[PDB]
Design goal:
Two copies of one chain form a homodimer. The first copy, chain A, has 812 residues and is α+β, with helices and mostly antiparallel strands. Chain A has a domain at 29-543: Methanol Dehydrogenase, Chain A. In chain A, 15% of the residues lie in helices and 34% in strands. In chain A, the strands form ten sheets. In chain A, strands 1, 39, 40, 41, 42, 43, 44, 45 and 46 form a nine-stranded mixed β-sheet that branches. In chain A, strands 14, 15, 16, 17, 20, 21 and 25 form a seven-stranded antiparallel β-sheet that branches. In chain A, helix 1 (11-22) crosses helix 12. The longest helix of chain A has 19 residues, at 786-804. Chain A is globular and about 90 Å long. Chain A starts with a strand and ends with a helix. Chains A and B meet through helix 1, strand 18, helix 11, strand 46 and helix 12 of A and helix 1, strand 18, helix 11, strand 46 and helix 12 of B. The structure holds the ligand *C(=O)C(CC)(CC)C(=O)Nc1cccc(CN2CCN(Cc3cccc4ccccc34)CC2)c1 (2 copies) and chloride ion (2 copies). Residues 28, 30, 94 of chain B line the site of one chloride ion. One chloride ion binds next to strand 2 of chain A. Chain B: Keywords: Aminopeptidase, Apoptosis, Cytoplasm, Hydrolase, Protease, Serine protease.
Chain lengths: 812, 820
């Protein structure tokens, strides 16, 4: 077996090769189905959606017409009608009025379509909402009880504005923009850094869905909101976008072990008169402190209202993220904010002791709670019950849907006597807990995956891995008599689905390893003898695939039975034009951290197109989902709890050796490893731990030191740093710099200079320690499109010079 | 001619080689007379010195004997002046009449007495801590010449005084609130700001008046002239921290070019003391009119102080473009008390005479630039409306020469009663007499410790100069009354740095040459009885002896060549050790090539530039060339690159390289590297950028890549304001020309300290921005927790290792040629 050496191109030649082979658009999303209700017309529904019609183009609202019937000989390809005349990330909509509300650039706008006004046959010039406010407005939302009112955030405070009367009003006075950020570290209605970055919650205020009627023929609107105080949170400096303006932007980063923000709930209570004028605005706070009522709660993971507006709800986590509580909060728990201590005591006495927080569900785990967007609340039939669907990995170690009924008891605790409540004083007895689904597979509830409930047929639609861990599929099952789980999506593809609100259609964005992404509309229907049985039928195409592009050769998914007692899956890019009796240099691409799966049956020729490019130059490319990876259940994921950096490279090496024994073209002498973020971290660990296996390591934005990363992430997987002193040490490459090679041309560090999730300090502290330890490195910095081209060029060239070509074999 | 290829050592082996192949000489001298007829010693000398190796800098003394055995060589012994502190001393004060030393060692401020009325110790004295109530580090202590019981110092950017007998402490300025943040509180007093320290070498910002003023009580008044600065309009910049654990950035005020400099003014603290040394009162006083009115056009207070009598406070002032110097006498009567009440403030202005006025006793201009220097000697004032003084200037002849100047102190034409602003030349004085003491194609030295000693008895002036050569500094002497013959006092084949006794009967010289390490030796001055002008020198004793030519270090040969520019350009050449016949070697050009610096001269370079020899041992030719713009050749030679930085320098570097390359066949022009720090890093980039043909690799260290990111004081002196010179700034900024770099990798290495506060990392990061935009390759190395230069030895060790290894892998070795 002779060594194959890659063609040694020049820098300018490699730039040309990358430029030629380079030459995507946001696929249709945020679907909404509106009925036409037109007996004489040919269309049943209009679908509205956000999309990008070309690659240059900006993201905007489109519509398409769903016909009542189709020619089943042909394939109907739906046309994209523009709804409007900068760019839109999301949109709100009120059904009854047909009002869209959306931000585009700095402006907030509104149009109407598909309400009583009817259905336009051409673009709509939208109406700009007026404002006195000097700064950018964020997070606009229509009031569900009155589409004339909207809310939004300006300078970390909540405002409301009437789109008819033009009345604007600031609701919270929590942030003063002109003062310094040391004293004023407060905010209302905005989610803090950790909650956005690590729990995917972006909004921090919620309209009450219904309005209460006043005595004099007006109404009361309500906004539940989160108020944060980040005064005790660590302040860190990262260099500003403008390098000519030599300064640093301050922001609050709760690093692991330190304080999270000081959180609490609030309610704005807005009295409006008979003709839409604001009478009064009472701001209201909890009767007792957040720490007392919600003992142990550190993070407000999720929050909203019940469909009737009766209770606000919230899904709450402790600091270790091992205990989740779903908690109903009455509006009567809130009293007006009064600085006068005598008048404050009055208002506490006026509230009954019966009014109390209601923990309607609690769960625990020795691993961790993964937060998700599934939580469906049924309408309240009985007065002292709440019925709902939730998902959990805590029973079986796999995420499944459960139908739960809780009893809303009077609390044992009484506030009159004025003590502190015990841990379980607000817990509700669980009357029923039916498991809707079960097995060695999971229901999906993140990154857009959720459920749709058909209350009439008493069915729930959900996405899952039942058929395979490498394919997402749409399923349906009864929540009343749960049994047979009907699949609705076709095997051989992975699907991301959106079910119509009327449960009579669904859209699926699907692909597989060979075929690019497509979006198609499927009609749901039942046989006459049984509404429980659900069948699907292709209706029309919304987006066609480009068709497998000859320049891109896809990988083969493989798998091996690991000594760890798990099947591990991988992707293998065999080199283009294999020579018999030769062995090629192998580049292992890695991520390997939690909340990610790189190996699955989806089209990888957009995101990971440049893996195919490495294979065209003569490299073998391997990707392996090690233990900790997503979509295999909680026990699989928990493998590295307290032990980050200590099991991942075993699984990689094991898979790399499995491939080697079966394919003689893999040259274990010339193996490189490369990844970004956790992949960059593991790449450093690979070179540190296994010099023998890995010749080169390219680390991108690597986490080098876990005490520098945030609370929400790090404490979930590694606990508090006091209770895992060794794991934090052994898991931190910056404090083991002595273990790196004394040879140069084996370590490449890549970092963005301004990156604020994985800070540059991770790289700069490593560099400092490598210099202390007399170790070599190579460094590329990317301050501030053009730099991604530079990155790909440098990486191809670095692999060429130090792994692929004959010059690399000489160099040693 | 075969190419020599250097040994390809591993990283571990180069670390070994460097590790294997890996102290302040006496200074701040002071002669004090014994006045002991029966004793064997004429003088005792005091001096700062590091006794050797890992040891702190401290006060020593030695004994100067009346006679010597001229058969033998006397070696003086160093007596420790101080005892161990129940850290190190950089600087000291002395009061002649009392014997009081004053100095800072570590945090504390101390005093001893020796050589005054109390006599001379024969054993180390115990230093006496000056006690304090101040919470923070005290800085810049200074003895009051008028009363050696009193001292002054800076604490939290304000001026304080402390009596060392009575123990009375007192705050004189309330300009800086130490507790409030620096974004609001950006004022200071008695402290030279960044640009003044970094670009004009002025460190102090307050000056004791050297004489007291007696009162009716039998007490006295003491005065302190001081600079007050308001940096509120000055650009703020954030650099990280020695603490990398806290992801945080510390702020400071950096006047970047074409932006606001600090808003400055003069102030005076009037300090009334009673009959037994207790403070009665402290009146803080300000100028009767603004600084912008009284000193029209002035932007930098370059130097300041008092006349010997304490009558006038002098100052040397510059305009923003640094093409106009003004020496100005400021009378104490120009200052009035500070007053909020605008009626009472007006009444004090009116009580001051109109005859009292600033006196511009000297003014000069140039098309090139003013170079500030420490030479300025005021004579005692005998005539009432005349001041007589020695100054130095390049503005007449284009070489720095001494001039004895007398100016007439006329009452001003301008009058303050009328209430108009004065005309540009209302304060100017008549120049009655301006005699040139020296002249020629050579300069008098007045920076970096070089100065003059005036013998007022025999009416002579001692000075350092380049008269015998630009490659050697020598001590000379000449009359200031009948200026004729310039007598050299130091021996040739040696560069000297000399300190002349206050009594003018001795001088000490620190000297070296290319082959011999540094030495310090004492020399007695005397004249034949018939003629006191004729000054001769005799060796007296050795203070510091040579370690000797160390056999690791082979010196370089000083070469020179006639450039097409019409200047002789001097250089140094390190030939490779064991130079093979019929073989050619990879060359490494070390460069600085910026203003205010000369790399090529006849001094020992085996300490500072030791690794140029290490390069030669591995088989590299090493060249160094002082191009046009460099120091010690006159203002015209220096002026060559005004408005044109980065354009002319490499022409001279390549010319010199080719002078050697034609004259020596061992110089392989196909493999030439370049390397430098600061301006040398700048030029290293420019060299590769402009001359891809000549230079294979460039290793730029802390490079200036964008002149708009550098400070006012430096950049505007050589380039003017950016508004007036858009082409100069564009053509002189490598960041704006990133497209011109090679599109071959392994030819560009950037080295930068992450926390550098003179040449900010910003220069490197913005260069990397434009190189990425231009699709160009680079290599980069960062050295965190390190400011101006590389202080931590492990990072210095890493710097030398990477630099040597980089040259090996991409220039010197077998594989380097195969790699193309
Ligand atoms: C970490 O999670 C980060 C940074 C904190 C979050 C945004 C991160 O993921 N950053 C980041 C930056 C730049 C690119 C990517 C993803 N990209 C996917 C495709 N991949 C192409 C590739 C892969 C393997 C080998 C090569 C070799 C040469 C050229 C391209 C290659 C690069 C990484 C993520
Ligand atoms: C510029 O003015 C700086 C940086 C902004 C502030 C003072 C500066 O000068 N920095 C700096 C950092 C580190 C070292 C030096 C000076 N040093 C002198 C000796 N020289 C040795 C040398 C020369 C040439 C080649 C080699 C090769 C290997 C090892 C040493 C070499 C290096 C620079 C200044
Ligand atoms: Cl929506
Ligand atoms: Cl002195």
């Amino acid at each position: 077996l002779e060594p194959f050496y890659v063609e040694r191109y020049s820098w300018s030649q490699l730039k040309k090769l990358l430029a030629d082979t380079r030459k995507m658009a946001k696929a249709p999303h945020d679907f909404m189905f509106v009925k036409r209700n037109d007996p004489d017309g040919p269309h049943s529904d209009r679908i509205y959606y956000l999309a990008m019609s070309g690659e240059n183009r900006e993201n905007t609202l489109f519509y398409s017409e769903i016909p009542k019937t189709i020619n089943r000989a042909a394939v109907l390809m739906l046309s994209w009608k523009p709804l409007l005349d900068v760019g839109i990330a999301s949109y709100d909509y009120h059904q009854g009025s047909g009002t869209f509300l959306f931000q585009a650039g700095s402006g907030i706008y509104h149009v109407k379509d598909g309400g009583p006004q009817g259905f336009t046959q051409q673009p709509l010039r939208p109406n700009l909402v007026e404002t006195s406010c000097p700064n950018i407005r964020m997070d606009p939302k229509l009031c569900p009880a009155d589409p004339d009112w909207i809310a939004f955030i300006h300078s970390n405070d909540i405002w409301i504005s009437n789109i008819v009367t033009r009345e604007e009003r600031r609701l919270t006075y929590v942030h003063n923009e002109l003062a310094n950020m040391e004293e004023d570290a407060r905010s209302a209605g905005v989610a803090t850094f950790v909650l956005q970055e690590e729990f995917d919650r972006y909004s921090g205020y919620w309209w009450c869905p219904k309005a209460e009627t006043t005595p004099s023929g007006g109404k009361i609107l309500r906004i539940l909101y989160e108020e944060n105080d980040e005064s005790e949170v660590e302040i860190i400096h990262v260099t500003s976008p403008m390098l000519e303006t030599r300064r640093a932007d301050s922001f609050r980063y709760p690093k692991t072990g330190t304080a999270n923000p000081k959180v609490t709930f609030k309610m704005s209570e807005i009295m409006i008169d008979a003709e839409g004028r604001i009478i009064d605005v009472i701001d209201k706070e909890l009767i007792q402190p957040f720490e007392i009522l919600f003992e142990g709660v550190e993070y407000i993971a999720r929050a909203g209202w019940t469909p009737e507006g009766k209770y606000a709800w919230s899904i709450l986590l402790d600091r270790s993220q091992t205990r989740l509580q779903i908690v109903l909060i009455s509006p009567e728990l809130f009293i007006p904010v009064e600085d006068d201590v005598m008048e404050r005591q009055r208002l506490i006495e006026s509230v009954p002791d019966s009014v109390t927080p209601l923990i309607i569900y609690e769960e625990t785990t020795d691993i961790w709670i993964n937060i998700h967007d599934i939580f469906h609340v049924f309408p309240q039939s009985h007065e002292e019950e709440i019925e709902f669907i939730f998902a959990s990995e805590c029973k079986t170690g796999f995420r499944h849907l459960y139908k739960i009924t809780s009893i809303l008891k009077e609390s044992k605790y009484k506030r009159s006597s004025g003590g502190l409540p015990a841990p379980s004083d607000f817990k509700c007895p669980i009357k029923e807990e039916i498991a809707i689904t079960s097995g060695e597979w999971e229901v999906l509830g993140r990154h857009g995956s959720n459920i749709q409930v058909d209350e009439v047929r008493r069915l729930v639609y959900f996405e899952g891995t039942k058929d395979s861990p490498l394919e997402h599929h749409l399923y349906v099952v009864s929540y009343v008599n749960p049994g047979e789980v009907t699949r609705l999506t076709d095997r051989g593809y992975s699907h991301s689905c959106c079910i119509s609100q009327h449960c009579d259609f669904f859209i699926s964005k699907y692909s597989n390893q060979k075929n690019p992404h497509c979006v198609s509309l499927y009609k749901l229907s039942s046989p006459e003898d049984d509404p429980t049985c659900k069948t699907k039928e292709f209706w029309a195409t919304i987006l066609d695939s480009a068709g497998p592009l000859p320049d891109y050769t896809p990988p083969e998914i493989f798998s091996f039975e690991s000594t760890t007692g798990f099947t591990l899956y991988g992707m293998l890019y065999k080199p283009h034009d294999l020579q018999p009796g030769k062995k090629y240099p192998t580049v292992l691409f890695i991520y390997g951290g939690p909340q990610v799966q790189l190996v699955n049956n989806r089209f990888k020729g957009v995101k990971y197109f440049r893996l195919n490019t490495l294979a065209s130059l003569g490299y073998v490319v391997v990707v392996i989902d090690n233990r900790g990876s997503c979509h295999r259940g909680l026990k699989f994921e928990g493998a590295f709890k307290y032990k980050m950096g200590q099991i991942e490279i075993d699984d990689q090496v094991e898979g790399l050796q499995y491939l080697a024994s079966r394919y003689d073209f893999i040259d274990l002498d010339r193996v490189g490893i490369h990844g970004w973020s956790y992949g960059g971290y593991l790449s450093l660990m690979a070179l540190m731990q296994r010099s023998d296996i890995f010749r080169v390591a390219i680390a991108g934005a690597p986490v080098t030191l876990w005490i520098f990363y945030d609370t929400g992430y790090t404490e979930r997987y590694m606990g508090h740093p006091d209770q895992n002193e060794q794991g934090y040490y052994l898991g931190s490459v910056a404090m083991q710099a002595e273990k790196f090679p004394s040879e140069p041309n084996r370590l490449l560090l890549l970092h963005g200079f301004l990156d604020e999730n994985v800070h540059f300090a991770h790289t700069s502290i490593l560099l400092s320690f490598l210099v202390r330890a007399g170790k070599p490195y190579d460094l590329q910095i990317y301050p501030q499109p053009e730099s991604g081209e530079h990155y790909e060029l440098h990486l191809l060239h670095y692999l060429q010079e130090n792994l692929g070509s004959r010059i690399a074999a000489l160099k040693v």
